[PDB]
């Protein structure tokens, strides 16, 4: 029937920031809820990117690997990607100009958006969380390997979600975009990028499923400090 | 299937309902597909909804607590298929806060949801039911105002409630949110406080939440991130 129009989420972003780095949600159980998405891995060991319908791990020492079916994640956002709009670019366009386009076709901030870009990127600045060790602290005071890596004139795939401003804490407020190269050898959490040329797929989503963990690490965590927003708009 | 369907469903949001969005097109019949248990309000804020044993009632500011009709529509509601893991009987008087103490002690983690139901005799109870609104649809803090507080005394009835994580304010009603109907099914409303004479409390925890965003233009243009939110919701729900 009517395709599965749901944002599935193993959660919370507030939890990931609180210091809950280990979940029991599997890559396999993620693929059950979509063919498309992003997130991280247990112990914050690099970035996850998922598309059509392949899961990759983007690690800290640069590099990237194909995700193994039974790896687990403390936070991930999946969906069956079914775009409704599309724009093609011949002239170079920035990350914001992409967001302008999407905002124009989907003005209401009260909805979710899934977006995918396939093309050649003139520049791209990324960050990538490094594998952690106990005691698991916040996602601030990382260590801080948040050094900014730079890609140049690389072909690749972009995967992203737009999350309502009022949903911060639950997910990443605003645009959250991940990147992997056509080689599948590099990428990460995008801070900014600019497109030389490419194809932008996107669509709005109205349904959100949140899967709250049952492990003690999640159960004992305080997910309501009034710090949050500047802390997450810092990852 | 093989795995329990224990999910908190809502047609949303509380911030949307607060902002002034008073009409959705989710029907009562739609809600029942997502639970036999729950609460909320009706379109044009026409009273309170309470659901238990898949029976749906409309609690009115009017006071004419009537049985809801399957085609009736709601701008906000919370449902679940009630599957309690705990049962507790009270032989001596206990307050709303003492009942909350029981639940908070058995389910200490605030990061999960709780569904709660009480059958029995209520010594006292205070309710406030929202009255049917006309345009311009306003923020719930604007109260215009047929929202008096009523006191029920020595009434048998059914209580239906949810406990929502403190960090999900705006999405739902943070903390304890409870509705009440008399054994008469002719009275009740949104609870502000209550005192249980004696009765049976059953409750359980839920790890899954399903949010269903409407597509109507009123929802699309509503401000769901006001500086007002937290205190405003708590002011409207006490
Ligand atoms: Cl991330
Ligand atoms: Cl309500
Ligand atoms: Zn990211
Ligand atoms: Zn209520």
Brief overview, please?
2 copies of one chain form a homodimer. By secondary structure, chain A is mainly β.
Q: Percentage of helical residues of chain A?
A: 10-25%
What are the distinct ligands in this entry? chloride ion, zinc ion
Beta strand count of chain A? 15
- Strand order, biggest sheet of chain A? 6-5-4-3-8-1-15
Report the top-level CATH class of the largest domain in chain A: Alpha Beta
Distance between the termini of chain A: 38 Å
How would a crystallographer describe the biggest sheet of chain A? 7 strands, mixed
Decide which structural class fits the backbone of chain A: mainly beta
Number of domains of chain A: 2
Q: CATH architecture of the largest domain in chain A, please?
A: 2-Layer Sandwich
Order of helices and strands of chain A: EHEHEEEEEEEEHEEEEEHH
Number of helices of chain A: 5
CATH superfamily annotation of the largest domain in chain A: Hypothetical protein, similar to alpha- acetolactate decarboxylase, domain 2
What is the overall silhouette of chain A?
globular
Most extensive contact: A-B, 30 and 30 residues
Family (chain A): Belongs to the alpha-acetolactate decarboxylase family.
Keywords (chain A): Acetoin biosynthesis, Decarboxylase, Lyase
Protein name (chain A): Alpha-acetolactate decarboxylase
Catalytic activity (chain A): (2S)-2-acetolactate + H(+) = (R)-acetoin + CO2
